[PDB]
RNA sequence: UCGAUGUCGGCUCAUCUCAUCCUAGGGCUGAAGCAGGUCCUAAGGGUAUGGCUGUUCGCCAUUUAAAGAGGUACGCGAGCUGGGUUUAGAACGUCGUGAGACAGUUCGGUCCCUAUCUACCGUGGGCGUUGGAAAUUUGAGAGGAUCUGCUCCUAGUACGAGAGGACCAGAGUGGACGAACCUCUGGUGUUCGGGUUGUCACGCCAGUGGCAUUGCCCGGUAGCUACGUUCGGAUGGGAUAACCGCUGAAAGCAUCUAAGCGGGAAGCCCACCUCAAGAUUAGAUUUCCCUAAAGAGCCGUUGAAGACUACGACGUUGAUAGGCAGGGUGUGGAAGUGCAGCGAUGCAUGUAGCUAACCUGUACUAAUUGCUCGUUUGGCUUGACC
RNA sequence: AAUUCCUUGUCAGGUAAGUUCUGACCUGCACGAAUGGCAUAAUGAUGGCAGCGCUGUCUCCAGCAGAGACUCAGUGAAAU
RNA sequence: CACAGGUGAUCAGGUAGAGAAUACCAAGGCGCUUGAGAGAACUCUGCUGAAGGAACUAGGCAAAAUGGUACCGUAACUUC
């Protein structure tokens, strides 16, 4: 459950450390982004001489949430942080290493790269 | 906040048309033959053939 | 187009082999005894009247006792009519029987019940009114209705305005619900979904009109 | 036992035998995972921090650390998604729920063994 | 709403309600017949009857547990001495309520609470 | 209107118009396709969040199918706010000799009213409905609802020099909105269980209780609840708008029109959900009863019903409530005793003790065949039958 | 600029986005030296702006506790 | 007004505590001259709150938060 003005850790090595949600995309009055949902972020904290710098506005996908993701059996799956992976203009991942686990909600076509690069997938 | 004209006596009494005094239900105790409120003891403490005093 | 009357027994889950949990609700189906068949000649329309459950004799009026005796059935806790057609009035005779066999697994049903009653409710809960400010100088109108109209024109409140009043305790229908499992020896009807009302409430299950 | 006797008939036909375990215990839960068409078992090791005992509606949440970040999963006990559960270490805790472990990390997020 | 909720308020805090029903339970154990308000009489059963149930079997733990809730050493002695071995074979319903009209001072509905079997 | 009609903006809550912003149907096109541009029809729904500023607006950021134009006392202060404007204090610039002044600026600066009538939202009482009653109902009508993205497929096809890229069909998955629900995931859970600080008391120890926001802290049942779950917005029928016709004369031709016959929109009327015979035109059907009946009510025990009501259940021919019993759940290891330790404490007895509202039973207590209301065959006229 | 009308002046910084803020420029409508000028440590329930923490301020409100509201009994106003 | 306001001085128990703060008690004194129910909306006063964390708003207003002792450590600037 990520909304505008919420902060997220970066689960990748794009250079960013913290990003802030400035838009939940995919609907006129759309409220929250969960895992797998595309958000507009501003980079609030970047690694020196990285690919992204502080103040970039870009796309990200939520990869883990503190609220959690529900599963078909009724189980919930919660993480200690809210994390995101930065994307390019076509909403494709821009990283080559993923930190921490992700979930199977990223399984599909676009985020299969994140899934394959993650240390652990739930 | 307040009326623009005084209510007529007819309208005041139409409002009071639902003002009634409740009438209690009464029974006769089998033992003493005294009248008492239904489902209530008598003044002497008798109820349904039993003493409390 | 005819259904049956049951009692909401409560909610639970059914697990599937793939490991999906299906939220289900359990309906006790006592026998639905047919108390009267209404036809177009006598009543102007076609319907089946059923009763289900029981009442003690001291609680059944002489008129209702004669009504049940004419059919040949035992007094139920209530009486319910289902609008039918010539196709539905086929094997349905007075004093006849309607069980949970009326529905098959995987059939979509409409379920009607009395919603839970919330009593007198304000606009915020009854109509999803926004609350006014909790702070910022707000006086004693935090859950107030707000404005109820315009000025001199129209100089009234329009009819159907959303206000506080009685909430719930009304007839409510939920459509598009799936029969998860039918059992007739035990009078069990397991349906996917929520089913308006509380446990012990009267529910009516009919074939789904959306189809 | 807490429900309508006819809800209980539907619930009792759905019960998977599993070994007993308490909060504080370290367990391995084998989770059925279906990638595209093949089904495998993924292990989930960690501490049972909480459980609600509700018959068919029983659940237990397990907390582990996965590469830095902590993960919790509230497994539904009688779900076929749970292939099996095995208890590695038995815990000696003083409370039903171990939510205080969420603020503990290393040498402080460790619970005594029950013997 | 109030769906399926038990307990009374009677215009009191919970501490006051607990203290007043403890007082009423002790008063009823000592005198075996009291006159109170009818809602108070109805709620008195849910406090006084469990004490008689637990005093049906006499032990140190049970006596201490009764004293925890009654705080009257006299009434705990009387409870475990005569009341438990008076209702030993009675499955509940150790006290009866008899409605007795309305109070003069404020027209409150009144009832007598009597211990069954010679109060 | 000056014996007072409160100003701008915001909030809340709206209602209407159509000169239509999106979605729908079209004609023309400097319409290849994809996209548009114009105009015609169309008001059923829908129609952002932020930064700045008191702002309306406006600019900007990021979205969206779209971020419409307006009316409604520039809707809405006896609904809220009080940032600006527009009292009294003070200061700057400027003007004045001055007292002072400024659609100049700056800092500061009391927003009352318990609702009689209309209206509206709910919920009752009375009477009526051609004797009365218990039920079940038809539906004249009324309200609700009506939004829409993306992905796949058709198909990299039609089209195109390429770049790009369809209609029409089909399948799925969302966003906003609404309803129900509590199985799950959580929240709360001040008559549930523990831990613990200060103090006071229960004669004392031990064990407990009061008070300190429930003293504080950690959990948590039922209920309630969303952020949780499930469902819904129809792809159908009828008549139409613009528009397109068929045949066809007036007007030997032509021509959708004058006769006649078609197609055609998220719009209209049905269809879906809810309410509905005070629809005074008060409808229908099945039973029951009439020298106080059939019933209804009072009273009592009461309910996921409820402001009071009403409504639902039950009153001994009884599980209606409380208790009680057996389970469950929660807490987490009672007390006492013993052992180990100098002791704090630990261990055992023993997953113990306690356990609200849950489940299933059970007459132990309380629901008194008491009283009141309600009758006695239901006017007349005509017709048909008898 | 507590002073600048035009005016949200321009340029720089800060934000994703800043009519406010800070720095600078000088075209000072209409600063300026005891109706004191420019600064200034400390101090201020002083004004403006920005952060950390923290949160029911808000998204979006839910549950619970007490006092009213509601019903009964007693007493019994108000403006108009 | 038998009115939550105001009214000078004196006395100053215990356990905690720096304390005449505070908490709980002693001596002493009181339960504040309407009660009884119910447990709707809504109002007041409180408590708790998923995820988020000022997006609220004119403005973080209100709230939440911090809070003791000892020790370590502490920048710009300064009138030292």
From TrEMBL, chain A:
Pfam family of the protein (one): Ribosomal_L14
InterPro entries assigned to the protein according to its UniProt record, in alphabetical order: Ribosomal_uL14, Ribosomal_uL14_bac-type, Ribosomal_uL14_CS, Ribosomal_uL14_sf
Molecular function GO terms recorded: large ribosomal subunit rRNA binding; structural constituent of ribosome
GO cellular component, one term: cytosolic large ribosomal subunit
Alphabetical GO biological process terms: translation
Keywords, in A-Z order: Ribonucleoprotein, Ribosomal protein, RNA-binding, rRNA-binding
Binding partners and assembly: Part of the 50S ribosomal subunit. Forms a cluster with proteins L3 and L19. In the 70S ribosome, L14 and L19 interact and together make contacts with the 16S rRNA in bridges B5 and B8.
Family: Belongs to the universal ribosomal protein uL14 family.
NCBIfam families assigned to the protein according to its UniProt record, in alphabetical order: rplN_bact
Purpose: Binds to 23S rRNA. Forms part of two intersubunit bridges in the 70S ribosome.
Name of this protein: Large ribosomal subunit protein uL14
Gene: rplN
From TrEMBL, chain B:
GO CC, alphabetical: large ribosomal subunit
Coiled coil: none
Record GO biological process: translation
Spans annotated as Disordered: 1-45
InterPro entries tied to this protein: Ribosomal_bL32 (IPR002677), Ribosomal_bL32_bact (IPR044957), Ribosomal_zn-bd (IPR011332)
Composition skew (Basic residues), residue ranges: 1-21
GO MF, any single term: structural constituent of ribosome
Record flagged with keyword Ribosomal protein: yes
Keyword annotations from UniProtKB, A to Z: Ribonucleoprotein, Ribosomal protein
PANTHER family: 50S RIBOSOMAL PROTEIN L32 (PTHR35534), LARGE RIBOSOMAL SUBUNIT PROTEIN BL32 (PTHR35534:SF1)
Family designation: Belongs to the bacterial ribosomal protein bL32 family.
Protein name per UniProt: Large ribosomal subunit protein bL32
Record gene name: rpmF
UniProtKB/TrEMBL annotation, chain D:
InterPro entries for the chain: Ribosomal_bL19 (IPR001857), Ribosomal_bL19_CS (IPR018257), Ribosomal_bL19_sf (IPR038657), Translation_prot_SH3-like_sf (IPR008991)
GO biological process: translation
Record flagged with keyword Cell membrane: no
Zinc as UniProt keyword: no
GO molecular function, one term: structural constituent of ribosome
Gene3D superfamilies: 2.30.30.790
Domain of life of the organism encoding this protein: Bacteria
Any one of the GO CC terms: cytosolic large ribosomal subunit
Keywords: Ribonucleoprotein, Ribosomal protein
Family per similarity comment: Belongs to the bacterial ribosomal protein bL19 family.
Function: This protein is located at the 30S-50S ribosomal subunit interface and may play a role in the structure and function of the aminoacyl-tRNA binding site.
Protein name, UniProt field: Large ribosomal subunit protein bL19
The encoding gene: rplS
UniProtKB/TrEMBL annotation, chain E:
Lineage: superkingdom: Bacteria
Cited InterPro entries: Ribosomal_bL17, Ribosomal_bL17_CS, Ribosomal_bL17_sf
SUPFAM superfamilies, A to Z: Prokaryotic ribosomal protein L17 (SSF64263)
Coiled-coil stretches: none
Entry GO terms, CC: cytosolic large ribosomal subunit
UniProt record similarity statement: Belongs to the bacterial ribosomal protein bL17 family.
Name listed for the protein in its UniProt record: Large ribosomal subunit protein bL17
Organism: Psychrobacter urativorans
């Amino acid at each position: 459950m990520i909304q505008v003005e919420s902060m997220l850790e970066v689960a990748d090595n794009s250079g960013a450390r913290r990003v802030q949600c400035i838009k939940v995309l995919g609907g006129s009055h759309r409220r929250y982004a969960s895992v797998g949902d595309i958000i507009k972020v501003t980079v609030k904290e970047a690694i020196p001489r990285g690919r992204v710098k502080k103040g970039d506005v870009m796309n990200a996908v939520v990869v883990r949430t503190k609220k959690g993701v529900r599963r078909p059996d009724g189980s919930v799956l919660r993480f200690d942080d809210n994390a995101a992976v930065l994307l390019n203009q076509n909403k494709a991942p821009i990283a080559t290493r993923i930190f921490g686990p992700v979930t199977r909600e990223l399984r599909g076509d676009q985020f299969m790269k994140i899934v394959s690069l993650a240390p652990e997938v739930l | 906040a307040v009326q623009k004209s005084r209510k007529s006596r007819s309208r005041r009494d139409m409002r009071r048309s639902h003002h009634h005094m409740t009438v209690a239900e009464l029974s006769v105790d089998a033992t003493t033959g005294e009248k008492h409120r239904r489902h209530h003891m008598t003044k002497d403490g008798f109820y349904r053939g039993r003493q409390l005093f | 187009a005819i259904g049956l009357v049951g009692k909401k027994c409560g909610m639970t889950r059914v697990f599937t082999e793939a490991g999906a949990s299906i939220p289900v609700t359990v309906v006790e189906i006592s026998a639905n005894r047919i108390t009267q068949v209404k036809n177009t000649d006598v009543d102007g329309y076609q319907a089946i009247q059923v009763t289900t459950g029981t009442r003690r004799d001291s609680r059944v009026t002489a008129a209702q006792k004669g009504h049940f005796a004419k059919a040949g059935v035992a007094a139920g806790r209530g009486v319910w009519e289902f609008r039918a057609n010539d196709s539905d009035l086929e094997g349905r005779e007075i004093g006849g029987e309607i069980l949970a066999d009326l529905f098959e697994q995987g059939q979509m049903v409409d379920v009607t019940g009395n919603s839970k009653g919330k009593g007198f409710q304000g606009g915020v809960k009854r109509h999803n009114f926004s609350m006014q400010d909790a702070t910022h100088g707000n006086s004693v109108s935090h859950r107030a209705i707000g404005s109820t109209g315009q000025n001199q024109s129209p100089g009234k409140v329009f009819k159907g305005k959303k206000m506080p009043g009685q909430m719930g305790n009304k007839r409510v229908t939920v459509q598009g619900l799936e029969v998860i499992s039918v059992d007739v020896e035990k009078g069990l009807l397991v349906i996917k979904g929520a089913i308006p009302g509380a446990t012990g409430g009267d529910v009516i299950v009919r074939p789904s009109v959306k189809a | 036992s807490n429900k309508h006797l006819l809800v209980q008939a539907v619930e009792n036909a759905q019960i998977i035998e599993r070994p007993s375990f308490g909060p504080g215990d370290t367990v391995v839960v084998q989770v059925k995972v279906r990638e595209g068409e093949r089904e495998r078992l993924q292990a989930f090791e960690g501490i049972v921090i909480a459980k609600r005992n509700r018959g068919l509606n029983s659940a237990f949440t397990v907390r582990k650390i996965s590469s830095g970040v902590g993960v919790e999963r509230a497994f539904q006990l009688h779900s076929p998604i749970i292939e099996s559960i095995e208890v590695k270490r038995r815990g000696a805790v003083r409370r039903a729920k171990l939510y205080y472990l969420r603020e503990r990390s290393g040498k402080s997020a460790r619970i005594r063994e029950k013997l | 709403m109030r769906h399926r909720k038990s307990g009374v308020k009677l215009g009191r805090t919970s501490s006051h309600r607990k203290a007043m029903f403890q007082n009423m339970t002790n008063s009823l154990f000592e005198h075996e017949l009291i006159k109170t308000t009818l809602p108070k009489a109805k709620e008195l059963r849910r406090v006084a009857e469990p004490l008689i149930t637990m005093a049906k079997e006499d032990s140190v733990a049970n006596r201490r547990l009764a004293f925890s809730r009654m705080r009257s050493k006299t009434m705990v002695g009387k409870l475990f001495g005569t009341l438990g071995p008076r209702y030993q074979n009675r499955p509940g319903g150790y006290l009866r309520i008899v409605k007795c009209g309305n109070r003069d001072g404020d027209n409150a509905p009144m009832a007598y609470v009597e211990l069954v079997d010679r109060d």
